[PDB]
Design a protein around this ligand. Structure first.
Ligand SMILES: [Mg+2]
Ligand SMILES: [Mg+2]
Lengths: 355, 358
């Protein structure tokens, strides 16, 4: 079982080093191999996704990814910027199914901007389509406007599009997730205005015929933004497109109060996945030894459960995280009154000790 | 001896009920205004066979600003689509070139428990979202369903829409938002997805070009995902936010929910000269139409926006806004915002309380 470890930039190495520490403390023998990605990829060989790094990711059974991006690299030309690595891995490896848990941990309820009764016990799952939508749709660019009242003027444009098989495959994923949970699926679109969205909804309804045991509901993205804020525990699984899922997953993450706890998984048709913290880069603390590693460690638990058929090992990691939280360990971002405040490495050590 | 002229378009159902109270508050002020009424919506249909009678449009064009109630009712829902009351909203925006949708997010401390947020995050909120209303993916061509013309799924059934914004479209919404920021705390946040969308990078570049005419306003940028997070975390961090049609729809709705009383919220649609149509954000309520219980506060607050943003009359706007704050302090509530121990009143008695607090 081969894992490609792609730590990235800034806090990425710091946090991934702790996930690797946790993986190495398990009974099982993994083949871990590291490769540069993001700014580190540019520094090593002039591209955020070096050919050799992509090749390693393709060969592996799963990918454990840190975070990319730093101030140092913001000046590079757009195509060589660190963030292009994430997009390239998703595209080249056909990782179309993104899973974003939003969980509020009992020790950390007060961190939420919501009144505590709205978030205590929150555990919902957003499924985000990751390979299509307006984020990739052609054509796109800047042009002279070809028509309308502003014909001839400079105009920026992108094309939103979704084909039948693209909606079908992410629908099935989302229904399968709902079957294993509370058997409730909400599909989010903007079908009262967008043709792409009505098409999405039609396909979702067609797929729903195959899952008579799952209650399908639909909601417009504007109303979903409202309803996540009002009462996020009304939902269980939510499925939506690339763009709307980017916005809603991030909203849901913030409503938990602690984005440093939340992992992300991006999977292909065979459940090979890239597993990463959901939170992204943190240039203000990068390299200072204080970033929360728990999202990244929990992403390694997801990796074991969903790609490497090691659910018992995933269970052990998740139990160890619960235990360290109950023992009072907190990194700076989740510090609570009277806690044992620790940096990244000492947090990792606490998790290992609780395995 | 020159008076400003306000076109008053009450509409249907609750529309006349709430607008009567905004007119009452305007008339209680010291300065005289020329308030001229005209029918719109179903009332326009009853008078002239169209939801936007020619004479109503002419009055709106002639006037310095427009105060609009709400249109729509069950009795008009059987009309053919083009004559339905709600068409008037679209007609006015199109004909008057009202492209900037002003959507305040305000939270009164007396009503803070209706917010899902911890009260310290939201009590006394007063931020402004300026949403481009006329363009974006919501209207862009081409769009529809087709066989995919290219790509890895070529030949498959595919739905599609086109996001597009031209230079004049972004430039005009930038000017309006920058000018709003000057009438507030001189901070403007532009929201886009410029890391991914070509439309958004273009938007950002035009916003920056415009910003060079407003050196006194601090411009910053934020991605729409991040803004969705930050509105939930700490909405008080903002002053004015400007964004496109679609992102503004989502973010303004999110913000409206975070205030907890979507029913108190005023709205406006402005042109390039800051002439605006001012209306409560809520629209029709056929269930309570004519029953004298609708909350007029959003409409009264819309009349305050009218004075501030269209008529260069910020001190009068402040006086109205202070009066609303006062009646809430005094314990007045309409049925929609009733709190334990309150003085519960209908529309007219709420209007009377605001007049008394001026
Ligand atoms: Mg995001
Ligand atoms: Mg909306």
């Amino acid at each position: 079982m081969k894992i490609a470890v792609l730590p990235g930039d800034g806090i990425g190495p710091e946090i991934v080093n702790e996930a690797v520490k946790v993986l190495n403390a398990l009974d099982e023998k993994f083949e871990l191999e590291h490769a540069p990605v993001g700014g580190a990829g540019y520094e090593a060989s002039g591209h955020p996704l070096p050919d050799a790094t992509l090749a390693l990711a393709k060969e592996a059974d799963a990918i454990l990814f840190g975070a990319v991006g730093d101030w140092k690299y913001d000046s590079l030309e757009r195509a060589l910027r660190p963030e292009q690595a994430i997009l390239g891995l998703r595209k080249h490896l056909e990782l179309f199914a993104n899973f974003r848990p939003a969980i509020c941990y009992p020790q950390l309820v007060d961190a939420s901007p919501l009144k505590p009764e709205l978030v205590a016990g929150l555990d919902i799952l957003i499924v985000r389509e990751l390979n299509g939508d307006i984020y990739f749709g052609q054509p796109r660019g800047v042009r002279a406007a070809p028509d309308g009242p502003f014909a001839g003027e400079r105009e920026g444009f992108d094309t939103m599009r979704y084909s039948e098989p693209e909606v079908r495959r992410i629908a099935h994923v989302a229904f399968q997730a709902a079957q294993k949970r509370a058997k409730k699926l909400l599909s989010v679109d903007k079908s009262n205005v967008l043709e792409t969205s009505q098409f999405w909804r039609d396909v979702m309804i067609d797929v729903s015929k195959e899952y008579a045991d799952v209650e399908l509901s639909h909601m417009y993205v504007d109303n979903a933004a409202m309803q996540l804020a009002k009462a996020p525990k009304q939902f269980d699984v939510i499925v939506t497109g690339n763009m709307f899922g980017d916005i809603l997953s991030d909203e849901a993450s913030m409503l938990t109060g602690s984005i440093g706890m939340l992992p992300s998984a991006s999977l292909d048709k065979n459940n090979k996945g890239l597993y990463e913290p959901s939170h992204g880069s943190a240039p203000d603390i990068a390299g200072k030894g204080i970033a929360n590693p728990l999202a990244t460690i929990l992403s390694a638990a997801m990796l074991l459960r969903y790609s490497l058929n090691r659910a018992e090992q995933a269970d052990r990691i998740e139990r160890a995280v619960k235990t360290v939280l109950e023992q009072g360990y907190r990194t700076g971002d989740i510090a609570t009154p009277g806690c044992r405040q620790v940096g990244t490495a000492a947090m990792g050590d606490a998790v290992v000790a609780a395995l």
